[PDB]
């Protein structure tokens, strides 16, 4: 009576197919769960209340196969549980939403359907599936607003969007970990009613909830009470109290039963790449604050470097001053580059990890998608940083030297970005990745051709300089600025042992090596948040 009941009890997107079953038999879990045995069928909603979950994982993570060794048996649709059968028949809705903030509900659902539905489906079929998913979860009044965490949607609306993302491919088994976590009482009641309506079809819904505040408990169809890992009661909720009254444990008046009984104790790689790059572009080109911050950084550093080494006026730039200017142009951007790239990578770790675990893409198209999505903003940053620097310093006039300088700076910053991507994909923590990237940057900086002359290096610093993109950048800029003017100042130093095209090819090879490192890191290392 106190909650909203003026709603629509219609099921717009039901499950068509054979009923799905989930039978667990004598589940034993250590490093916890002892002799757990239940059997649920499609059309029923099971809520696991109590102290469920041993450590980093939970009970439903044990059911799916995540997590720490099992000693029982788990059956999915009459067949033993397997890492492929689970991802083929079971959908999982974690307690932490991982959604792009700049996209709307309709756009996110369309992207997830284009990356989930088979390639034989028509565009009208995908649109109809998205519309059915929107209508079933009552998101028709929010399909045109963004999912920003930013104004965005509400908490219950975001949870419904996550449920729809996990429901687009029409799963027969759905599991949710703490769906009402951080939601208002009425919003939690509405979400539980929506989950019960979803279970009212031909779907098997499992829910992991810690504390139902005496309104969520009244909506439970089947409940599983767990105490310190072992089950106490399994059956309907409305009879639970009765089951405890017939054995000698009556529930006192004005006391929630749950609280009392717990205190008692297709489509293809190319299509995947296209969808991923389109989604990344649509999400990144709408983040005005981040783009403005990057542009401000680039413009500030470029103006500082150009006015510090201002070549116009009375006195012209000296040779040592020009060398210092080139070295600073080469070695000042990696700080901000590493910072931004590592921050953006660690801000998207959970979503990428969960989409790789669910099976959206095969970690191959994601690499090229991320690279080609970083390319346009990288080119804009390179323009803003380099072009209002070559003229402010009054460098070598002409079109060819300026274009060569711009191309070399672009390639070197691209190599630095790929190195940052690899360092982020290789280390699990933001601080460790930042420290490793700073160590590599300092090594390549000391290995530069401006401070240790490239001759006071015995064996290892020489090789580091040979594999340092900053040294090659400095040498290429020196060759562009001083060769054919002129070459003897290049020959007294050691900036004359490699031609310009060789330096460009070496930079491209370093970029390719860093790309291979980033790819093998994405492939063979789990991107755990």
């Amino acid at each position, epitope marked *: 009576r106190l909650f909203s009941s003026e709603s*629509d*009890n*219609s099921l*717009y997107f039901t499950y068509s197919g054979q009923p799905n079953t989930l039978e667990v038999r004598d589940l034993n879990y250590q490093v916890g769960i002892q002799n757990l045995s239940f059997k649920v069928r499609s059309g029923q909603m099971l809520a696991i209340i109590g102290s469920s979950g041993c450590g980093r994982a939970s009970l439903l993570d044990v059911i799916t196969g995540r997590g720490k060794i099992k000693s029982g048996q788990i059956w999915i649709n009459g067949q033993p549980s397997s890492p492929q059968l689970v991802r083929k028949c079971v959908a999982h809705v974690r307690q932490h939403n991982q959604l792009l903030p700049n996209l709307t509900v309709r756009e996110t659902l369309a992207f997830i359907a284009q990356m989930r539905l088979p390639r034989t489906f028509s565009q009208a079929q995908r649109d109809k599936r998205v519309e059915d998913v929107i209508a079933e979860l*009552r998101l*028709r*009044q*929010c399909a*045109d607003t963004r999912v920003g965490n930013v104004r965005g949607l509400s908490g219950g609306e975001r949870r419904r969007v996550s449920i729809g993302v996990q429901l687009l491919w029409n799963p027969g088994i759905l599991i949710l970990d703490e769906p009402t976590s951080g939601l208002d009482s009425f919003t939690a009641h509405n979400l539980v009613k929506t989950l019960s309506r979803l279970a009212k*079809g031909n779907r098997l819904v499992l829910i992991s909830l810690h504390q139902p505040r005496s309104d969520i408990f009244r909506l439970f169809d089947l409940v599983l009470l767990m105490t310190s890992g072992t089950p106490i009661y399994l059956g309907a909720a409305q009879h639970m109290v009765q089951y405890f009254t017939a054995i000698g444990y009556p529930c006192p008046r004005y006391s929630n039963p749950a609280d009392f009984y717990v205190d008692l104790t297709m489509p293809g790689a190319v299509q995947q790449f296209t969808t991923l790059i389109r989604r990344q572009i649509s999400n990144d080109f709408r983040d005005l604050p981040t783009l403005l911050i990057h542009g401000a950084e680039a413009c500030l550093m470029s103006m500082t470097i150009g006015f510090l080494y201002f070549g116009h006026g009375s006195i012209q730039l000296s040779f040592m001053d020009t060398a210092a200017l080139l070295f600073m142009i080469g070695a000042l951007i990696p700080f901000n580059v590493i910072l931004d790239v590592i921050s953006k990578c660690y801000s998207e770790r959970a979503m990428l990890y969960y989409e790789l675990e669910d099976g959206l893409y095969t970690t191959g198209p994601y690499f090229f998608a991320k690279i080609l999505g970083e390319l346009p903003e990288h080119c804009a940053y390179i323009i803003i940083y380099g072009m209002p620097t070559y003229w402010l310093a009054n460098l070598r006039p002409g079109l060819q030297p300026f274009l060569l300088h711009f191309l070399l700076v672009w390639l070197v910053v691209f190599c630095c970005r790929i190195m940052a991507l690899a360092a982020a994909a290789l280390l699990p923590t933001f601080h460790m990745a930042s420290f490793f990237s700073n160590a590599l940057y300092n090594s390549f900086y000391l290995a530069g051709g401006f401070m240790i002359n490239l001759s006071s290096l015995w064996t290892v610093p020489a090789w580091i300089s040979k594999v340092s993109f900053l040294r090659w950048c400095f040498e290429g800029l020196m060759k562009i600025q001083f060769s054919r003017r002129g070459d003897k100042i290049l020959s007294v130093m050691e900036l004359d042992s490699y031609p310009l095209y060789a330096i460009y090819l070496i930079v491209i090879g370093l970029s390719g090596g860093f790309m291979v490192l980033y790819y093998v890191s994405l492939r063979f290392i789990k991107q755990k948040p």
Partner: antibody
Amino acid sequence: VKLVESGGGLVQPGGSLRLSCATSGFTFSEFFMEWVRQPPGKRLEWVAVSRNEANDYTTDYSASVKGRFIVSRDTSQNILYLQMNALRAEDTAIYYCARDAWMGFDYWGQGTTV
Amino acid sequence: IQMTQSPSSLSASLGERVSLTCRASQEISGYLSWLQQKPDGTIQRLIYAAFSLDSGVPKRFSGSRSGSDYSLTISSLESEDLAHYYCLQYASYPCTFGGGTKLEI
């Protein structure tokens, strides 16, 4: 798709009347079915809805007719039935028989006056 | 959700263009339908999703959205367009209809 209403007549308050809607041209079991009346001085009012087979053929009515109207279907002949009891208090309209409420009211009928 | 349709009555002639507006009290996200009821009593859905057209509907009927208003535009009016027009929302329960517009000639 063809929707043909029938059963409209003259019944003053106190009695009852059953209107029929002869559907044809589509699978009657896989689509909703709505009754939506139109009084003379009232723009339009959705009256009742009967869901498809996937919803176990549950029904719903508006607050103005909840408790007096009963919508049902004959899945063998594909015919909508609307039994109105204690009617004509203010329910004199041109009741129409449409297919889909949630997907936009499409494929209307012709309406019967009562 | 209250659907205010403007105007309640409109008079024009052949060759002219007509634009009927519908304002929703809440956000419907384009889930609007334009229905035509002929003088005999037959009702036919002219536009669904506020932008799309039904099969068998002349391509002169179009749907536009200006802010929070949805407009049905009938270019090159004909004598067959003398009928009642209704806007309808179906984004939220229950489904409510518009005030109506009698397009006279």
